[PDB]
Amino acid sequence: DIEADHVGTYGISVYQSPGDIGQYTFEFDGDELFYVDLDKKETVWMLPEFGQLASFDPQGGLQNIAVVKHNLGVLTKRSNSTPATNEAPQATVFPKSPVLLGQPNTLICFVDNIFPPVINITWLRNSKSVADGVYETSFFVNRDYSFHKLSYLTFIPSDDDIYDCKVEHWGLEEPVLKHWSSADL
Amino acid sequence: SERHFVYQFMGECYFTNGTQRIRYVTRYIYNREEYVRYDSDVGEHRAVTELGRPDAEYWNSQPEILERTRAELDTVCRHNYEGPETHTSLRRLEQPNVVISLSHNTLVCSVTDFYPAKIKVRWFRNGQEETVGVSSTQLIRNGDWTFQVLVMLEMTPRRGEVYTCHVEHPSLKSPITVEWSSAE
């Protein structure tokens, strides 16, 4: 509802209980600048080159989660509000670049309507868990306060393979598997 | 607490015409509901929801706490934008990759891996800007600081047919053009 040339979300603190699950990030124009690893107390930049030009004191992220955790504790006791419903996540799989057989590419698994932000997004190549060449983003915020998150699988396009983005979430009564294959073409 | 609850806070900095204009909102969200918030335009903390009344007054009742918050528009927004952002975000320019491939057939122009989001793709048939039979996907956010967009042209390959995908992007000093002939 508020228009602009640019949106800088400087400070997003997400906290969940029970579990003391926290997430701190910085966004700009909808992309992730960095997230503060709450355990290692380290600012992790999504783009390595950006980290060499700018910096951020992971302490600020730690302070943020401190307050946010307190506030929650207050609200969880100051209200009789009923816990929001476990939304069912929705996944879409698409290639970062135009598929070309035998040419390295990246399968992207975009998962939306995630709530609460607790999920397992895994990849399967021929019904088998892929461990290497997989990267995941932080939980991005949505206007409706649910979240989205992307996972990436580095791969070599071949019609002999069938892939699967497997999503596990409390709001799904069974793991959802989004299939993809260059063979569909 | 035996039940799972989600609390969220965020500081949004809206820039327009650079820093020339800066609106600053702070939002406190609980269980998917925004309850209290600070808008730079309003000048102080407001109870977005009822559960927020206690807090709006409470924080507005602490001169420096409420005066540090109003200053964040300068401490954070203006400062982050005019400094760090100008060396990173505002100067990232990724040149879109452009390719044409077949799909009474359809031509698909894949415009990929570009940044920023701003882009204009156009099809030309014999130096003439084609507009009918054209359709584009929405802007696709790859989540890794790159976007992509696929533009299709429905057509009838008439011998002597020169179809050109025309892409204009800030990372490009000169518009990119890829051509495809019934021959190719």
């Binding site: 400087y10 400070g11 603190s13 910085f26 600048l33 060499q52 030009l53 700018a54 910096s55 951020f56 004191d57 600020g60 992220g61 302070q63 943020n64 307050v67 946010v68 307190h70 506030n71 504790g73 207050v74 609200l75 | 806070f9 965020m10 500081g11 702070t26 406190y28 206690p54 807090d55 409470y58 924080w59 706490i65 540090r68 918050t69 964040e72 401490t75 954070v76 400062h79 982050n80 400094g83 760090p84 060396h87």
Partner: peptide, 15 residues
């Protein structure tokens, strides 16, 4: 060298 980024500071609600 590096230009530091500052963040908003969430306020504490009384318990």
């Amino acid at each position: 060298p590096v230009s530091k980024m500052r963040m908003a500071t969430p306020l504490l609600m009384q318990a």
